[PDB]
Amino acid sequence: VTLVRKNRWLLLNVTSEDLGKTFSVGTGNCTTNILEAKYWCPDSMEYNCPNLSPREEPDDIDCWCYGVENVRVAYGKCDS
Amino acid sequence: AHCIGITDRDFIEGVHGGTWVSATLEQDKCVTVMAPDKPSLDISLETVAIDGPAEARKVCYNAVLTHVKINDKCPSTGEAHLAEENEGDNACKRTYSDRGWGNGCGLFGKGSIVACAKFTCAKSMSLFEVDQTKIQYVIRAQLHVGAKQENWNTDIKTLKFDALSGSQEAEFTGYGKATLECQVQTAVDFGNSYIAEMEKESWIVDRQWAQDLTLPWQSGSGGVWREMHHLVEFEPPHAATIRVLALGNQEGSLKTALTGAMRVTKDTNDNNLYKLHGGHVSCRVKLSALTLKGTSYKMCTDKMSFVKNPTDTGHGTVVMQVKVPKGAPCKIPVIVADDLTAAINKGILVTVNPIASTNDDEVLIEVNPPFGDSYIIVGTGDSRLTYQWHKEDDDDKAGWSHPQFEK
Ligand SMILES: *[C@@H]1O[C@H](CO[C@H]2O[C@@H](C)[C@@H](O)[C@@H](O)[C@@H]2O)[C@@H](O[C@@H]2O[C@H](CO)[C@@H](O[C@@H]3O[C@H](CO[C@H]4O[C@H](CO)[C@@H](O)[C@H](O)[C@@H]4O)[C@@H](O)[C@H](O[C@H]4O[C@H](CO)[C@@H](O)[C@H](O)[C@@H]4O)[C@@H]3O)[C@H](O)[C@H]2NC(C)=O)[C@H](O)[C@H]1NC(C)=O
Ligand SMILES: *[C@@H]1O[C@H](CO)[C@@H](O[C@@H]2O[C@H](CO)[C@@H](O)[C@H](O)[C@H]2NC(C)=O)[C@H](O)[C@H]1NC(C)=O
């Protein structure tokens, strides 16, 4: 995984190697469970990762963060 | 002379005193025009095509989606936006997703969500405007002079036409000239038709049908794709994501729909030339300027011989190749009589006034013998050539119409 600061947003750039992994981001954490994700290519996807409350269980999302604001996940579906 | 090489043939007969005749030229057919004291004229429709038709539209049937962006906002916090929405090369969709506790929203309800994707057209179908006036058609013309088959292609004058091209002259050295006023008649109305192109394949399609296609289309000269959403699939949204997928290649569907359409042959050499099928050309031919060479020539009196024996053409006519070793320049005397005694010509001479300008010339002569038993007689005296012939009375491939007089 690579995490980059782009303007107001913080970009979670993940691969198939990051499947289900949780990462410590600053004072909070972030998690992605995206089977679709493989390696980067123009056939990509980028969207928001909801900032959840301490006891907020994920609902209808495959990417989320606890205590981290303005994070978007991005991934590719191509093989290296 | 080339009509002999062509299976479907028709004979136009001119009435003595007339100057014009009317002929209908279909593709893959030939027409032999005969007038008294005039050399017979083979005319045939080679190709009917359109050259450089302006491209009206392009219709993408295979699209490729790249770089999908999705933005969202919790209920009652405003609409969600993307910069790609302003980008013309992007197909976008605005909708709403169920939000609340579980996806980081303090309110339960419909939250804004938008998806954008970079649209690239992998494969598109071209649609050309067919101009009635820019329609071109080519006609081969040739005379019956006595040329060997091996020479036909060099004696054939090629007449190029378009709509309102004016009359075209066909000038034959030593035999004058014939004039053709042609009008092209197409099978298809082009006021409501496009020329559709997919890969190497081409068709004639209806304009209204093509415009009504639920597919992304691009204007002439291009640069903008309209109605991209026809090849883009947005699945029902989740809280913060939407699965956006490019639709399947619509090549198959398009071809399927195109099975019920007339087809067009794209020219092999030129990428802009489109040859039409089934069209015909109505021609008016002036013959009064045609003349016969060797009218002053004395008749051949020397011993001639058959290079090629009289043979059926499949048109109910007979061709022979006669060698003239001595006597040239001279007229070759040819009749088709009832017997060896009579001297009345019952046959019809396609090669009007056959001549041998030089010695050892081999003159190809075509003649239409009468039905039943007859004798083909070339030359006179004891050295003359005779060949017994019989015409079956069975149906031949050649068509004969009523002789015509036009002032
Ligand atoms: C990513 O971050 C998630 C969010 O964690 C938040 O919480 C704080 C503590 C920090 O971790 C911040 O990063 C963040 O804002 C993690 O999910 C959460 O993890 C925490 C820690 O394990 C869970 O908290 C625990 O909840 C237990 C609930 O059981 C009891 O709860 C009620 C009261 O609510 C009790 O009355 C009942 O008896 C229930 O049995 C609770 O038992 C725990 O308390 C004990 O532990 C804490 C700290 O260890 C200690 O201070 C306390 O005195 C006790 O000893 C604790 O409160 C939380 O439930 C959980 N939430 C969800 C939605 O999963 C996530 O694990 C993390 N990911 C990784 C990989 O680390
Ligand atoms: C996510 O990470 C990939 C992998 O690094 C990024 O792709 C890189 O882009 C650079 C140009 O900026 C190129 O050298 C290659 O395409 C990639 N480099 C390497 C080393 O793999 C991709 O741009 C990232 N996604 C986003 C949205 O930033």
Nearest to B283 by CA among B373, B404, B103: B404
Nearest to B308 by CA among B83, B148, B113: B148
Q: What is the DSSP letter of A70?
A: S
Place of tokens 């639709």: B247
Residue count (chain B): 407
**CA of B219 to nearest chain A CA: how many angstroms apart?**
27
| Residue B153 identity (one-letter amino acid) | N
Q: In angstroms, what CA-CA distances link B233 with B63, B70, B115, B160?
A: 11, 14, 11, 51
Experimental method: X-ray
**CA of B112 to nearest chain A CA: how many angstroms apart?**
12
Q: What is the DSSP letter of A35?
A: T
B110 alpha carbon – ligand 1 mean position (Å): 29
Q: Indicate the burial class of B153 (C-beta count within 10 angstroms; 0-12, 13-18, 19 or more).
A: exposed
Ligand 1 atom closest to Cα of A53? Answer: 15
How far is C-alpha B37 from the chain's CA centre?
Answer: 33
Cα dihedral across residues B129, B131, B132, B136: positive or negative: negative
Contact at CB, A50 and B239, closer than 8 angstroms: yes
Ligand nearest to the CA of A51: 1
Nearest to A1 by CA among A22, A65, A52: A22
Cα gap B375→B341, rounded to integer Å: 10
Q: Indicate the burial class of B347 (C-beta count within 10 angstroms; 0-12, 13-18, 19 or more).
A: buried
Contact at CB, A43 and B65, closer than 8 angstroms: yes
Closest-CA residue, ligand 2 atom 9, reads A40
Strands B135-143 and B157-162: antiparallel
Contact at CB, B67 and A46, closer than 8 angstroms: yes
Q: Is A18 helix (H, G, I), strand (E, B) or coil?
A: helix
Buried b (16+ CB within 10 A) or exposed e, B209-243: ebeebebbbbeeeeeebeebebbbebeebbbbbbe
Q: Is A24 helix (H, G, I), strand (E, B) or coil?
A: strand
Torsion angle of alpha carbons B141, B145, B148, B153, nearest 10°? -20
The answer to whether residues B272 and B279 touch, using CB atoms and an 8 Å cutoff, is: no
Measure CB to CB from residue A59 to each of B65, B67, B239 and give the nearest one. Answer: B239
Residue count (chain A): 80
Q: Is A17 helix (H, G, I), strand (E, B) or coil?
A: helix
Neighbours of B278 (CB within 10 A): 11
Q: Indicate the burial class of B173 (C-beta count within 10 angstroms; 0-12, 13-18, 19 or more).
A: exposed
- Best residue among A23, A55, A57, A64 to mutate for probing ligand 1, ranked by most atoms within 8 Å of CB: A55
By C-alpha distance, the chain B residue nearest A40 is B67
| Residue B185 identity (one-letter amino acid) | Q
Nearest to B141 by CA among B317, B1, B313, B37: B1
Q: Indicate the burial class of B159 (C-beta count within 10 angstroms; 0-12, 13-18, 19 or more).
A: buried
Cα gap B62→B199, rounded to integer Å: 12
Ligand 2 near A15 CB (within 6 A): no
Place of tokens 């090489």: B5
Q: What share of residues in chain A are helix, strand, coil (percent, to 5)?
A: 5, 55, 40
Give the per-residue SS3 of chain B.
CHHHHCCCEEEEEECECECEEEEEEEECCEEEEEECCEEEEEEEEEEEEEECCCEEEEEEEEEEEEEEEEEEECCCCCCCCCHHHHCCCEEEEEEEEEECCCCCCCCCEEEEEEEEEEEEEEEEEEEEECCCCCEEEEEEEEECCCCCHHHHHHHCEEEEEECCCCCEEEEECCCEEEEEEEEEECCCCCCCEEEEEECCEEEEEEHHHHHCCCCCEECCCCCCEECHHHHEEECCCCCCCCCEEECCCCHHHHHHHHCCCEEEEECCCCCCEEECCCCEEEEEEECCCECCCCCCCCECCCCCEEEEEEEECCCCCEEEEEEECCCCCEECCEEEECCCCCCCCCCEECCCCCEECCCCEEEEEEEECCCEEEEEEECCCCCCEEEEEEECCCCCCEEECCCECEC
Q: In angstroms, what CA-CA distances link B13 with B3, B123, B183, B283?
A: 15, 54, 21, 14
Neighbours of B249 (CB within 10 A): 14
Buried b (16+ CB within 10 A) or exposed e, B190-204: beebbbbbbeeebbb
Q: In angstroms, what CA-CA distances link B143 with A74, B101, B146, B397?
A: 77, 93, 9, 21
**CA of A25 to nearest chain B CA: how many angstroms apart?**
17
Tell me the two tokens of residue B160. 């190029």
Strands B9-13 and B398-400: parallel
Give bridge partners of residue B47 from the DSSP assignment. Answer: B138
B274 alpha carbon – ligand 1 mean position (Å): 75
The answer to whether residues B14 and B404 touch, using CB atoms and an 8 Å cutoff, is: yes
Contact at CB, B241 and A63, closer than 8 angstroms: yes
Resolution of the model in angstroms: 2.7
Tell me the two tokens of residue B341. 């005694």
Q: Which domains does chain B have, with CATH numbers?
A: 1-51+133-186+262-292 (2.60.98.10), 52-61+122-132+187-224+250-261 (3.30.67.10), 62-121+225-249 (3.30.387.10), 293-407 (2.60.40.350)
Closest-CA residue, ligand 2 atom 21, reads A40
The answer to whether residues A35 and A70 touch, using CB atoms and an 8 Å cutoff, is: no
Counting one residue from chain A and one from chain B, the pairs whose CB atoms sit within 8 A come to 67
Q: What is the DSSP letter of A54?
A: T
Measure CB to CB from residue A59 to each of B102, B118, B242 and give the nearest one. Answer: B102
Cα dihedral across residues B202, B203, B207, B211: positive or negative: negative
Angle ∠(B344,B320,B322) on CA atoms, nearest 5: 90
| Residue B99 identity (one-letter amino acid) | R
Contact at CB, A45 and B68, closer than 8 angstroms: yes
Nearest to B73 by CA among B53, B92, B96: B96
Tell me the two tokens of residue B351. 């090669």
